[PDB]
Amino acid sequence: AHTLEVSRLIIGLLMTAIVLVFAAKRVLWLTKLIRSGQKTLDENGRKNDLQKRITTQITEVFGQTRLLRWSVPGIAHFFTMWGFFVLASVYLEAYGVLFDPEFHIPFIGRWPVLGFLQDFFAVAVLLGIIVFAIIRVVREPKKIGRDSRFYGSHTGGAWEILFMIFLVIATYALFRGAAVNTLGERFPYQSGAFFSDFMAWILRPLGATANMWIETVALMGHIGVMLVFLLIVLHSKHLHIGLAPINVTFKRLPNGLGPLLPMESNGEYIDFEDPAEDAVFGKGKIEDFTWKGYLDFTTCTECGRCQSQCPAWNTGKPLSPKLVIMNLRDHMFAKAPYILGEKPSPVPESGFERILGSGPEQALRPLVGTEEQGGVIDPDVLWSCTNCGACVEQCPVDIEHIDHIVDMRRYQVMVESEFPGELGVLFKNLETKGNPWGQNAKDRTNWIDEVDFDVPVYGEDVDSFDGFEYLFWVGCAGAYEDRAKKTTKAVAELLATAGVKFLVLGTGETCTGDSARRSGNEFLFQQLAAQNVETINELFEGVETVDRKIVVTCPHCFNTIGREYPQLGANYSVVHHTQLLNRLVRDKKLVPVQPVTYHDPCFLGRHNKVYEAPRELVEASGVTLKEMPRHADRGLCCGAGGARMWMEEHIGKRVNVERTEEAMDTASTIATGCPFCRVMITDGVDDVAASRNVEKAEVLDVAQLLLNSLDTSKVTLPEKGTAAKESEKRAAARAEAEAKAE
Ligand code: HEM
Ligand SMILES: CCCCCCCCCCCCO[C@@H]1O[C@H](CO)[C@@H](O[C@H]2O[C@H](CO)[C@@H](O)[C@H](O)[C@H]2O)[C@H](O)[C@H]1O
Ligand code: SF4
Ligand code: SF4
């Protein structure tokens, strides 16, 4: 009897002490690795607005708002997660019982309610394991292939952890029954605890004689399994247990979408007019990723939520947001001895596994390189991204895939000088003519000559911004592209009908650089953005920050002029034409008098969270809006973002074709909100219709749908030169008033 009395403590304590040495030896090692990355300046090192960071950390972690969006797995994880917190109380009882069998949680160790929660969660976690187990059996990668949410994931490590949770419950159940039989009335939860009472009933026949050994065997298993399970987690892909709460603390706010962060080197922003000799552009090796970058890599849960939504992955291309993180994460660990200084420096779509081990070959691999180069990330993976944002919008742990993808592009374009040959034409056209098409700058104001109403042009006829409300910014697409130019005229006509006083910079405009920045060429973007910020700033001289209004017809201008120029000192209030037109129809300025489908632009919908305004215009125009199977924040890319408009799709199905086939199945009329969405979808309709041998679907812009519904017969738009005459009158009147006074 006494042998079991003391043996419980002798085995229990040494197991804890021995394991905590190994467990604590790796916690320092992981910390020594995650903190070995480059430091960060963004948001004061991801520390500004601290109070709001824990506010989202608690809501996203404990509330699981970010995670419950996927119903079946999120709900199961909710009980799996909260169970761990509750079962933590059990381990306190188990450890204390070693010192004395009468031990119980002093303050609450006999409260009947706490027993119900432990028992309720003791089986709720069991369901969580089953629900997770069923999903992987149904979605088996070997049975489904690339369509599987778990393709490329390490299935071996996922089942290993699920098995250990089962043992913890199985050992937990055995202890509860054994404890009741041995302790009897002295058992802490003598009342309630149905799951603990249930076990005692089945274990009762063995009697107190047998259960004396069962309790000790069960207990040592409960502590032993946990300690053995603790070591597995630290050395397994399950690291998101402790890192996930931290990766959400330092998350990019409000989300990992929107503007592209300025480049920094070793904790300092790069001065592009005087970059330092040691300045590093982009990220050409795993050591260039910041300490936050390493945290993202290790926090990946390999859930595949991002992968199931990637336009590139689902159209047959090697790119996968999951595998990019996994390949970077695995490369990070494989190269760890060289990063930490321990050694002196010397599935087919998963690029890391091309070179394995931590030998010298791992240290010499390019971060981005073809198979013959052994690179971790194939160039087709890197250049297949469209910057749609489906991965970032979907990550429960806020990994910000786009930041890593375009930070690697920055190295290729700006340092390595390697990029698809189709971007070479883009950069030469932008840097010589100011537009990606390479057309003459003098032809920018041609679209003004093709309309029959007055569109004042700053510098050309009107000398100042006085008396005007909005700067209408067209962009290269709205001035040079035949189909996009159609929308620009419609928007200008709508504003004139609504009476909004506006002007256009005309030939003083140049490319914003959204394609230039997201292709990785930030030398070009800073060269183009600086010209636009300076050009616009002169227009708004003497204009209060509130009145510095801009209206754009492209989500990319909306995203760049509004969110990325402020990094250069801008304070512009830019609004997409759908928002401006929506509140004009709201304000009864515009009076509109079979089904239609709307394609959400990823830079309008997903990045800038503009969903209701474009759809209200569609409804206000009298047509019936039919949502696609994939729409709103789960919309699909047409393949135009991230400079993919200028490259060519060699691999797999064409993204615009996949979207168009879905769009045409929904309705025969498609409404878009971007110059590039219209071009891609319109081109896709030509391919899809020809393949299907059916009449082409009508692709229009939400501005054109609104205009067609207006009864413009009663409206007389301003005659050409009307704004010029007013400018002369105001200028002449002011001159006369001052001349006659002085
Ligand atoms: C705090 C205790 C936690 C426990 C005990 C726990 C446990 C688990 C386990 C065992 C899985 C495997 C699911 C499967 O194999 O299908 C899982 C999945 C996951 N966990 Fe946790 N986790 C915890 C914390 C967190 C937190 C705070 C987050 C924050 C986002 C998180 C995010 C995820 C995600 C995204 C998945 C993937 C779910 C899926 O594949 O559908 N975990 N968790
Ligand atoms: C069961 C799983 C167990 C997981 C075990 C491993 C845990 C790893 C913990 C490390 C977490 C990252 O820890 C993070 O490190 C960074 C990098 O220095 C610190 O960063 C801090 O110092 C750096 C420089 O040293 C500054 O640039 C930064 O502005 C400042 O915040 C963060 O304050 C800290 O939050
Ligand atoms: S990157 Fe995020 S969404 Fe994708 S598998 Fe990893 S944890 Fe899941
Ligand atoms: S941004 Fe879109 S295309 Fe790029 S990796 Fe993420 S999901 Fe794929």
From TrEMBL:
Presence of keyword Oxidoreductase: yes
Start-end of Basic and acidic residues biased regions: 722-741
Transmembrane portions of the chain: 11-29, 74-92, 112-135, 156-175, 187-206, 213-234
Amino acids binding heme b: 77, 136, 149, 240, 305
Chain positions recorded as [4Fe-4S] cluster 2 binding sites: 310, 385, 388, 391
Annotated keywords: 4Fe-4S, Heme, Iron, Iron-sulfur, Membrane, Metal-binding, Oxidoreductase, Transmembrane, Transmembrane helix
A GO MF term: oxidoreductase activity
4Fe-4S ferredoxin-type domain boundaries: 291-321, 373-405
Entry annotated with the keyword Protease: no
Binding site for [4Fe-4S] cluster 1: 300, 303, 306, 395
One Gene Ontology CC term in the entry: plasma membrane
Protein name stated in the entry: Iron-sulfur-binding reductase
First and last residues shown, out of full length: 2 to 777 of 1042
